[PDB]
Design an enzyme around this catalytic site. Structure first.
Site, PDB file in Angstrom:
ATOM      1  N   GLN A 120       6.847   7.737 -10.189  1.00  0.00           N
ATOM      2  CA  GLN A 120       6.079   8.789  -9.464  1.00  0.00           C
ATOM      3  C   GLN A 120       6.889   9.337  -8.282  1.00  0.00           C
ATOM      4  O   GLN A 120       6.662  10.502  -7.904  1.00  0.00           O
ATOM      5  CB  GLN A 120       4.755   8.224  -8.952  1.00  0.00           C
ATOM      6  CG  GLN A 120       3.606   8.438  -9.915  1.00  0.00           C
ATOM      7  CD  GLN A 120       2.300   7.941  -9.346  1.00  0.00           C
ATOM      8  OE1 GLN A 120       2.123   6.749  -9.100  1.00  0.00           O
ATOM      9  NE2 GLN A 120       1.369   8.858  -9.138  1.00  0.00           N
ATOM     10  N   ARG A 162       3.983   2.342 -10.704  1.00  0.00           N
ATOM     11  CA  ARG A 162       4.381   0.913 -10.738  1.00  0.00           C
ATOM     12  C   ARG A 162       4.517   0.445 -12.191  1.00  0.00           C
ATOM     13  O   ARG A 162       5.455  -0.338 -12.483  1.00  0.00           O
ATOM     14  CB  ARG A 162       3.329   0.088 -10.015  1.00  0.00           C
ATOM     15  CG  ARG A 162       3.268   0.414  -8.537  1.00  0.00           C
ATOM     16  CD  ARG A 162       2.105  -0.304  -7.916  1.00  0.00           C
ATOM     17  NE  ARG A 162       1.735   0.285  -6.658  1.00  0.00           N
ATOM     18  CZ  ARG A 162       0.675  -0.081  -5.912  1.00  0.00           C
ATOM     19  NH1 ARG A 162      -0.120  -1.066  -6.309  1.00  0.00           N
ATOM     20  NH2 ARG A 162       0.460   0.509  -4.734  1.00  0.00           N
ATOM     21  N   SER A 163       3.608   0.870 -13.056  1.00  0.00           N
ATOM     22  CA  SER A 163       3.599   0.498 -14.497  1.00  0.00           C
ATOM     23  C   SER A 163       4.904   0.966 -15.144  1.00  0.00           C
ATOM     24  O   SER A 163       5.499   0.261 -15.971  1.00  0.00           O
ATOM     25  CB  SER A 163       2.424   1.124 -15.220  1.00  0.00           C
ATOM     26  OG  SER A 163       1.172   0.585 -14.822  1.00  0.00           O
ATOM     27  N   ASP A 169       0.855  -1.221   0.000  1.00  0.00           N
ATOM     28  CA  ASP A 169       0.000   0.000   0.000  1.00  0.00           C
ATOM     29  C   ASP A 169       0.880   1.257   0.000  1.00  0.00           C
ATOM     30  O   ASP A 169       0.534   2.189  -0.730  1.00  0.00           O
ATOM     31  CB  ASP A 169      -0.955  -0.006   1.204  1.00  0.00           C
ATOM     32  CG  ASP A 169      -2.288  -0.664   0.896  1.00  0.00           C
ATOM     33  OD1 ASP A 169      -2.300  -1.547   0.030  1.00  0.00           O
ATOM     34  OD2 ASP A 169      -3.319  -0.235   1.472  1.00  0.00           O
ATOM     35  N   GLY A 204      -1.492   4.226 -14.179  1.00  0.00           N
ATOM     36  CA  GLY A 204      -0.658   3.804 -15.334  1.00  0.00           C
ATOM     37  C   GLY A 204       0.641   4.581 -15.483  1.00  0.00           C
ATOM     38  O   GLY A 204       1.102   4.677 -16.628  1.00  0.00           O
ATOM     39  N   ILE A 205       1.263   5.073 -14.399  1.00  0.00           N
ATOM     40  CA  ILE A 205       2.530   5.835 -14.552  1.00  0.00           C
ATOM     41  C   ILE A 205       3.568   5.379 -13.550  1.00  0.00           C
ATOM     42  O   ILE A 205       4.743   5.463 -13.884  1.00  0.00           O
ATOM     43  CB  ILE A 205       2.290   7.368 -14.526  1.00  0.00           C
ATOM     44  CG1 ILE A 205       1.656   7.863 -13.228  1.00  0.00           C
ATOM     45  CG2 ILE A 205       1.452   7.796 -15.719  1.00  0.00           C
ATOM     46  CD1 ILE A 205       1.543   9.393 -13.184  1.00  0.00           C
ATOM     47  N   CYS A 251      -1.579   0.094 -13.516  1.00  0.00           N
ATOM     48  CA  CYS A 251      -1.734   0.137 -12.041  1.00  0.00           C
ATOM     49  C   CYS A 251      -2.999   0.987 -11.867  1.00  0.00           C
ATOM     50  O   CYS A 251      -3.955   0.807 -12.604  1.00  0.00           O
ATOM     51  CB  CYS A 251      -0.436   0.618 -11.412  1.00  0.00           C
ATOM     52  SG  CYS A 251       0.286   2.091 -12.193  1.00  0.00           S
TER      53      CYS A 251
END
Ligand SMILES: Cc1nc(-c2ccc(C(=O)O)s2)cs1
Length: 282
Positions: free
Chosen positions: A262, A221-222, A181, A218-219, A215
């Site tokens: 991120q 973990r992806s 998390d 989309g920026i 994810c």
């Protein structure tokens, strides 16, 4: 490992937040006009995460071609990825239409449906063999064929059927279920084993359309997924593997979708994944 020396330097000097800001500063900025049209407002999960117009995936529907999805094309690595947001209740049909239209063989999911007590993604695949999903808006049927649950990830075989033409394809769903998390995994071992499982499936191979990676936004973990895969592939291709600069690869990928990686912690994790994955080859 020249990068492993760059790693110790940044780590010993605690300069991760600094490196990360220079990447933010140097990152490309392209128009995202289609994303910001008022008719597309409910097709975006986050108002500050938009595909660039030049790299956006277009749906083949005359009405509204828009989905929050980008094509990353890594020319030298000969790898292409679609990065997208976790589908919304109203975009699950668009998501599967994109998978169908782009001839993707794999979907990589790096989030749980619920994290931090909020929904990060619609439940967009069936939970039981005998309860298939029909997307009336895009004329697709999706069936769960099998599910293999492991400690760190789940692999699902799905059948996608175009109800219009009665063609069927097998789609593999790779679901990494243990990303915490908060922050990043302590060790990249389970993330690398997951990445090698995706590769072994053939989902990243040029015979197929690009893999879909998501994810929530989309920026983040992806981004780490694609960055580690591309860096390891370039190490394999190159006559001078040490010439491989993670920061340069990240800036290239950022030409195609904003904000990949991120946090300074995801950047540190990306270095660690690539460094350990390079040791796997040896
Ligand atoms: C044959 C292979 N070599 C590598 C690397 C060797 C040295 C590196 C460096 O110093 O950065 S990368 C990865 S696979």
């Amino acid at each position: 490992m020249e990068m492993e020396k760059e790693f110790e330097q940044i780590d010993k000097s605690g300069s991760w937040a600094a490196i990360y800001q220079d990447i933010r500063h140097e990152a490309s900025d392209f128009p995202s006009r289609v994303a910001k049209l008022p008719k597309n407002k409910n097709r975006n999960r986050y108002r500050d995460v938009s595909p660039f117009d030049h790299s956006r995936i277009k749906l083949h529907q005359e009405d509204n071609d828009y989905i929050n999805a980008s094509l990353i094309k890594m020319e030298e690595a000969q790898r292409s990825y679609i990065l997208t947001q976790g589908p919304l209740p109203n975009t699950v049909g668009h998501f599967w239409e994109m998978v169908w239209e782009q001839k993707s063989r794999g979907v990589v999911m790096l989030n749980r449906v619920m994290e931090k007590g909020s929904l990060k993604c619609a439940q967009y695949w069936p939970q039981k063999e005998e309860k298939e999903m029909i997307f009336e808006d895009t004329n697709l049927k999706l069936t769960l064929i099998s599910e293999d649950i492991k400690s760190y990830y789940t692999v699902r075989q799905l059948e996608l059927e175009n109800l219009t033409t009665q063609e069927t394809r097998e789609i593999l769903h790779f679901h990494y279920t243990t990303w915490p998390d908060f922050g990043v995994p302590e060790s990249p071992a389970s993330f690398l084993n997951f990445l090698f499982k995706v590769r072994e499936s053939g989902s990243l191979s040029p015979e197929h359309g690009p893999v879909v990676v998501h994810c929530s936004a989309g920026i983040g973990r992806s981004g780490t997924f694609c960055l580690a895969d591309t860096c390891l592939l370039l190490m394999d291709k190159r006559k001078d593997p040490s010439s491989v600069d993670i920061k340069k690869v990240l800036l290239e990928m950022r030409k195609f979708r904003m904000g990949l990686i991120q946090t300074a912690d995801q950047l540190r994790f990306s270095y660690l994944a690539v460094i350990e994955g390079a040791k796997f080859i040896m």
